[PDB]
């Protein structure tokens, strides 16, 4: 029973590989020979936000490019005003450990998750004038690794029990479930139209999910180790992944394979966060060796380096209008590069 | 209007600063312990459990890892800021001791856990006494081993059981002395199935860890 299914699976995998090799007419690094270089991008630190006590783990820019939410391990969740460097809200969390935080597109809700397996959604309206738990979701059995707001009432979550979930905040129930991975699922990224999304797990595969249907469409296995970072290209038809193998890879949703690989011989450190720029020409990758490399996303060359941090870069965020880039690391500082 | 907002946000900033200057004071004072142990082992003596207590007007938070997944390589990197990792193993089916050896090896060699100290408890010392009449099979090096001249045995203990104790200890010590001695240390202890001195032990080692950390700052150790 198992032999006729395993051999069939091997045949189907070989068919997919041969289809990919059949469609491989050329590479991105051949048709981009006559492209002007991006020069030396020398970015400057404009601000330095200093409020957190423990290491900063995750951050997320708001849709207005004004406010940002930062989550530390000390149990505090701080909302920063990027212009005036004023702390707007400080929220004490019930648990100490936080792994994810998300800022709603409308700015009404802030969600946070960690090892506690409970996703706390905070309402920022507060006509009383104090933050309060709107509703807490407890339907996971591992640890909550990443969450993102589709809109005010829907939130996608990623857990460490090999499954992803979609919640309804008003009811507090799971709308559906996503069961395709065979390892811990690290992070996910939503398309601008909120129609499709990708999920990167610790089995070196990336799954393309249909939000409305509840099934996966594509599986991309181009990596050698666990995929930590994943970020959609601004048009929603490509995405770049950052694994522990120290190489970045750029995948496509229509070519159904990798387009380009980013590697340097003097870099043997793991990748913790990636993010495209507004236009998509620059790709910012925060590495384990205490700096952020600015990769040319169409030439595979280093535009520059952001060596401002004194400890492991944990999170990297780019504004929706591309005006600034904020990076958070384990030295408890937020560096905003111009 | 433009002035009122730029005064209100200054006052909001100052109030949040005052709150963080009382919470920074609390956070730096309290020490943190990670209670990592096997399921077989007696770890009793949502996802995560928490114990909050105090000894000699010093606060201790101890964190019990509950219903997690067996893949530790991701979530353990959140624990590189605790003051000590307490590691409890039950002496004895498979070779659970070999799994404990491999886990301790992985903890020790880990890059992000080089600045964290490990407190070590050897549990089920009574079961070892019960095993003297029924071990040697899974270890070919127990025969070529002598009992320490510098470790005193408590009264009423079969010397073979003390030999097994010190052998197991030295199996953990060879791992701990294999690399990275300078940065962090390993503190092995003994414990019964029912014992009460354990908390005093942990206290008298946590002080030692903090003292050695300050002496590392002044480049003395």
């Amino acid at each position, epitope marked *: 029973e198992l032999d006729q299914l395993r051999q069939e699976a091997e045949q189907l995998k070989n068919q997919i590989r041969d289809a990919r090799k059949a469609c491989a007419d050329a590479t991105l690094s051949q048709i981009t020979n006559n492209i002007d270089p991006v020069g030396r991008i020398q970015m400057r630190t404009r601000r330095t936000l200093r409020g957190h006590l423990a290491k900063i783990y995750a951050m997320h820019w708001g849709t207005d490019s004004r406010l940002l939410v930062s989550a530390s391990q000390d149990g505090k969740l701080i909302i920063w005003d990027s212009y005036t460097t004023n702390k707007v809200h400080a929220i004490p969390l019930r648990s100490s450990w936080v792994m994810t935080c998300a800022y709603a597109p409308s700015g009404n809700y802030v969600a946070c998750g960690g090892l506690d397996n409970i996703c706390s959604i905070y309402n920022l309206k507060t006509r009383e004038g104090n933050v309060r738990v709107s509703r807490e979701l407890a339907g996971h059995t591992g640890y909550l690794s990443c969450c993102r707001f589709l809109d005010d009432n829907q939130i996608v979550t990623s857990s460490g029990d090999t499954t992803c979930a979609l919640w309804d905040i008003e009811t507090g129930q799971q709308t559906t479930t996503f069961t395709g991975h065979t390892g811990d699922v690290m992070s996910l990224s939503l398309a601008p139209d909120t129609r499709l999304f990708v999920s990167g797990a610790c089995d*070196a595969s990336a799954k393309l999910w249909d939000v409305r249907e509840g099934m996966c469409r594509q599986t991309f296995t181009g990596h050698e180790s*666990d995929i930590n970072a994943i970020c959609f290209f601004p048009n929603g038809n490509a995405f770049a992944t950052g694994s522990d193998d120290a190489t970045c890879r750029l995948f496509d949703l229509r070519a159904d394979q990798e387009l380009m690989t980013y590697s340097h011989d003097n870099i043997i450190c*793991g990748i913790t966060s990636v993010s495209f720029s507004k236009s998509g020409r620059l790709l910012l990758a925060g590495y384990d060796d205490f700096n952020c490399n600015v990769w040319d996303a169409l030439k595979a060359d280093r535009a520059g380096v952001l060596a401002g941090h004194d400890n492991r870069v944990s999170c990297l965020g780019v504004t929706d209008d591309g005006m600034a880039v904020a990076t958070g690391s384990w030295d408890s500082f937020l560096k905003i590069w111009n | 209007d433009q002035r009122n907002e730029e005064k209100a946000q200054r006052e909001a900033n100052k109030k949040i600063e005052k709150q963080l200057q009382k919470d920074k004071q609390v956070y730096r004072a309290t020490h943190r312990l990670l209670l990592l142990g096997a399921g077989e082992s007696g770890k009793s003596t949502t996802g995560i459990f928490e114990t909050k207590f105090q000894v000699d007007k010093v606060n201790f938070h101890m964190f019990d890892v509950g219903g997690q997944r067996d*893949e*530790r*390589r991701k979530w353990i990197q959140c624990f590189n800021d605790v003051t000590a990792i307490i590691f409890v193993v039950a002496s004895s089916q*498979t070779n659970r001791l070999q799994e404990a050896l491999n886990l301790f090896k*992985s903890i020790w*060699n880990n890059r992000w856990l080089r600045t964290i100290s490990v407190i070590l408890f050897l549990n089920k010392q009574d079961l070892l006494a019960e095993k003297v009449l029924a071990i040697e099979d899974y270890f070919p090096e127990f025969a070529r081993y002598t009992t320490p001249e510098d470790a005193t045995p408590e009264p009423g203990e079969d010397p073979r059981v003390t030999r097994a104790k010190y052998f197991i200890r030295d199996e953990f010590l060879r791992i701990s002395t294999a690399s990275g001695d300078g940065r962090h240390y390993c503190y092995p202890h003994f414990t019964c199935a029912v014992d009460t001195e354990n908390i005093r032990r942990v206290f008298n080692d946590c002080r030692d860890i903090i003292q050695r950390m300050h002496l590392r700052q002044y480049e003395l150790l």
Partner: nanobody, 126 residues
Framework: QVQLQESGGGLVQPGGSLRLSCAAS????????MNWVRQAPGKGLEWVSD????????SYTGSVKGRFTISRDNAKNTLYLQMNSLKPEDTAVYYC?????????????????????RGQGTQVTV
């Protein structure tokens, strides 16, 4: 795509000798520390032996220490295990396992809950 293909095995008599191979395809074999894990019938996964990237540092489980010989071939990308002085108690399913991260010393590959970086396994019976 990281894929591992165990080779060799079969029914052998106690006191015999047998060799295994592990075809490592789809990754940079030279930069990964690897090891052998086994599953005894009705028991959990137990560590057998390992080998570092360069091949200098080698260690074995006590019960099989000095009886097995692990060797990696970075030229052809294959892991080679020699087993002499076989015992009736050494029957198990063998897994060629890879450590998840490059250029490191620590590994976490004893997870029975569908650990992705190990081969399908081979049967050894005595």
């Amino acid at each position: 795509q990281v894929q591992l293909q165990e080779s060799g095995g079969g029914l052998v008599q106690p006191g015999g000798s047998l060799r295994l191979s592990c075809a490592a395809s789809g990754f940079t074999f030279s930069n990964y520390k690897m090891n052998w894990v086994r599953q005894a019938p009705g028991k959990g996964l137990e560590w057998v032996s390992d080998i570092s990237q360069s091949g200098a540092s080698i260690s074995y489980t006590g019960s099989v220490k000095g009886r097995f010989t692990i060797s990696r071939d970075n030229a052809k990308n294959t892991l080679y295990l020699q087993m002499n002085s076989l015992k009736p108690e050494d029957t198990a399913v063998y897994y060629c396992a890879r450590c998840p991260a490059p250029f490191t010393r620590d590994c976490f590959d004893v997870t029975s809950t569908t650990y992705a970086y190990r081969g399908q396994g081979t049967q050894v019976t005595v």
